[PDB]
Amino acid sequence: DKIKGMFNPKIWDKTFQDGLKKEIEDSQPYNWGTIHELVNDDLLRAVRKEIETEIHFTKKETDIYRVNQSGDLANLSGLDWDDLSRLPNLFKLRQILYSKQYRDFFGYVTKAGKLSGSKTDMSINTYTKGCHLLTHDDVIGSRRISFILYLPDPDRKWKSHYGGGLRLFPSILPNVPHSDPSAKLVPQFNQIAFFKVLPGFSFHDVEEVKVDKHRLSIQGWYHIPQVGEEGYIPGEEEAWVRNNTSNVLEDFEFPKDERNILSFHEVKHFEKMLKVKLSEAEFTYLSQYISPEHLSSKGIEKLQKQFVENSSLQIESFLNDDKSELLKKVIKQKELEQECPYHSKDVKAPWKTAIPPHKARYLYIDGKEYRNFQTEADILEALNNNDLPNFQFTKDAIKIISDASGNSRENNFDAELALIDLAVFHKSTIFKKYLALLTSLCPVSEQILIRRFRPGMDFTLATKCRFNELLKSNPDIIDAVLEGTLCLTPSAGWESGELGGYELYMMDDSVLINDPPAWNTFNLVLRDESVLEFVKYVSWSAKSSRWDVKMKWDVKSC
Amino acid sequence: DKIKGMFNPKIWDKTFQDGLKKEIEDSQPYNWGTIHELVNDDLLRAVRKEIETEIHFTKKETDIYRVNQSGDLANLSGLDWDDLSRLPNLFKLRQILYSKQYRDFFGYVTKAGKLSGSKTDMSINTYTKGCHLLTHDDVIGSRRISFILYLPDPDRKWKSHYGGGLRLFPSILPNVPHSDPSAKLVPQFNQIAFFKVLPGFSFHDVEEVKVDKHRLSIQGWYHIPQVGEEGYIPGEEEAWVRNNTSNVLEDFEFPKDERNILSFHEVKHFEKMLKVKLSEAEFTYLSQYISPEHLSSKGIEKLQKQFVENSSLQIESFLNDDKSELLKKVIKQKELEQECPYHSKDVKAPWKTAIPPHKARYLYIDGKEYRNFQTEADILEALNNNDLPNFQFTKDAIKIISDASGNSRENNFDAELALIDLAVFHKSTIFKKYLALLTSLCPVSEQILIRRFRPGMDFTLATKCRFNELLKSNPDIIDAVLEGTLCLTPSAGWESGELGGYELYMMDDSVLINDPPAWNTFNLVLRDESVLEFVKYVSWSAKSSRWDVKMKWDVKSC
């Protein structure tokens, strides 16, 4: 048997097979398996060499990933699955993996039943330093089992600190993965990792590659049997796709994309002004935080003109010298002298973790009562007991925790307190008057968040604004959300190192803004329904978190 | 001189006059004066006797006062200012008070200028136990100087503990009086108190009469001179009335009549249900606070029917036995064993004082950061820095104050903590689902306040609901405010003693609800634009404060 002989002879042994089936049954957080030294060593070495000589990889980055790919439609990479003339060993590899012999073995140990021999579905990718793939479940089309065969250097050990681990996530509920993974597989040459595709459950990701090494892999899927194949059931595939394609789940997303309506006093002030002038006292108040260049008569005129022309502002050195210096000092001190929580269970007041991880992950201060979501019950409690932001109470709580601890260089809340003070400034009636002056728009609601995006952990994905549905019938209220981001990231290397963390606004060139983290910048965007936004995953190589203050307002023409 | 001789001879003495003018100039909180032994003693004694024999007084109560009056249009009291046949001494008294001789004296010492001799304007009233007159400024029509001549028993001293003091209020700003008075005059027979009417400033009230005594007085006004009189200036009166008749001041009112919009999760739950059923788990949650009789299938059906027919509910024994007993214990303990603040400066977290006192006075917990409004600056700071309610943070702050003090029978916050727990129950998603079930209305916003109305201090006046102006164009949102009051007043005697504190709803029989304070009642009223509501001034004779929880929701047909 020329097929059987191209695999490790152990895989044809009944005792081995039963042992592996048991391993898979007993695995966590959902059923998965691995086999070491799977394929004939000479064959797999020859495949690696063919790939190196015949395939050219191209970096592709999206919100969800950065991966060096070879699957371009025109086959300019050199990989054409319809014509493997220059890769005969790869041809042999695909043939043996989709053989009846292997499929019968593989379907048995995974309890997946019959698998398609003809619907071959493989991809060849490399992950180099900074490459990653964020949380997802693989539930697409007729996929039945996911597999990844790893081909890093056969004569060197791939090490845990290299990154590139396959990580698997437990679930709080179906389609609601826990923020932190519970298993990690470190890939080696000729090792295969695999799992039955599980709608709602099979959440996994590829840990960023943290060093200058090349993680080469062949990712594939076994599919539901097709017409004329063993195990084919007419209608099975159609039913599977339908049941996986066909908004209760938004309840499990935190923070909520919700704004609170402003006071009668506030709205009157904005209306009165826009039906042109700030008092000297009001300018004095603004000058406590904002640079003089953005408060001068001609500075304001320029900003007003820019907003009219672009429906956005990108302001540099937004905060004045005093506040910029204060914030830089306290943020740098926290970055360099304090320990950051790197698991949601370890996050303490005033911080929360954005969830679920197939949508976002980051730390935030919202001014609401402390939440740490580890169980379904924790989430249900929050939903039954909505509370509203209160930044002064949050400040108060911080002082009491701090005074109990001693307020040292290791545990002080100087950064959080300074950032909350900044949030309170932006919550002030006078700030919103200034915002109204710049935009000729009348804020009627607000949400303010302080965010920290940790290296190797944090990101958001491309999403649209959420309109205040109670305000939809109001003809004065514009069909848009005004969104501000005050970036306070003190480290460098973001652009040159491609460290992620950039704020991206695009139309659904479609890119409106692509802004790597910087220090003391203020972005303002009037978002209509279609505009997409995200903050890119922050690389482990970043020398600080991305820190910012995120602000959102419903607005009326005034 | 028959006129001069009917007054104390001292008032015609230049040295006396100048001394009095100086007293008035140097007085606080606004210029006022008093003269002792003003009138011929025999004359004033004869006037008192005529009043006792010839005038019948009738108790009249409104939101602002309770006073035994004699000014009925038909003159059934026996007092007819056009025919004093049976009161010739009263005739003589009016004549001398409006004489040129007296007006020249009175106008001089008050720096009020000329006064009308013909536009006589007097009223005769008695204040008996429980009678009072709340804060007001006397600024009506052509009134120039206010005076009150007191005629209690001439042969007994009126004592401070009798009450019935004339109290004068300082101002934070024009038309914004301080909550607490800064001067009090204790009336005696033949004593006159007076002040120039001052738009924006001349705020005064009559302290409740606290004992079974009869405070008889003649209140009057001197007016701007009329045509043909000394000092008449054509157009003066018209200009005065115009400048006093012709909404910035709502900024100074606390608490704000403002509701916060509910979460997306909440509104979805109500919509889903009303487009009929609560789960067993939801009933279990409700049963923690609410009596079984209001959660049963037929109990609910009855309430639903009552609300359909009346657009209101009046529920007795609302809370279950466990919670009723807990709340009664802690409220009674606070009433009987702890000291209540009786000046706004003495009110501490978590309590605030409703202001200004010509509109309302009471203590409330709103869950917002602590405020104590003693200056204009204090108010302006709050207005520039709006914050939102957070009951858990309020609870947290209470524990830290309590643990610093020792948590004794004298200083514990057991009542406040139990009341906040109750507020949190009513803030729960499941409670609002139950509310939606009872009413077939869909809450979309909320405000919850805990209120304490102290004996001898606290009240509100008749006002309409305030619509959420941002929601006016929404056709689904009903032009009404749903309003709940959970009364938790543990003392008795309210109705029999006429102790005030009643909750009054009336159409602008017009009375919808007149409900004296009781224990564990829940009133629910769907208020359209016109419906007026107030809580009547609580008598010093009440044996506890009125305690309640006030709830307001915007609602849609769902």
Ligand SMILES: O=C(O)CCC(=O)C(=O)O
């Ligand atoms: O390379 C891996 O380990 C897994 C890749 C993956 O999950 C995917 O491409 O869907």
Ligand SMILES: O=C(O)CCC(=O)C(=O)O
């Ligand atoms: O009787 C008093 O002392 C004052 C009465 C009063 O202020 C009034 O009737 O307007």
Ligand SMILES: [Fe+3]
């Ligand atoms: Fe995958």
Ligand SMILES: [Fe+3]
């Ligand atoms: Fe008065």
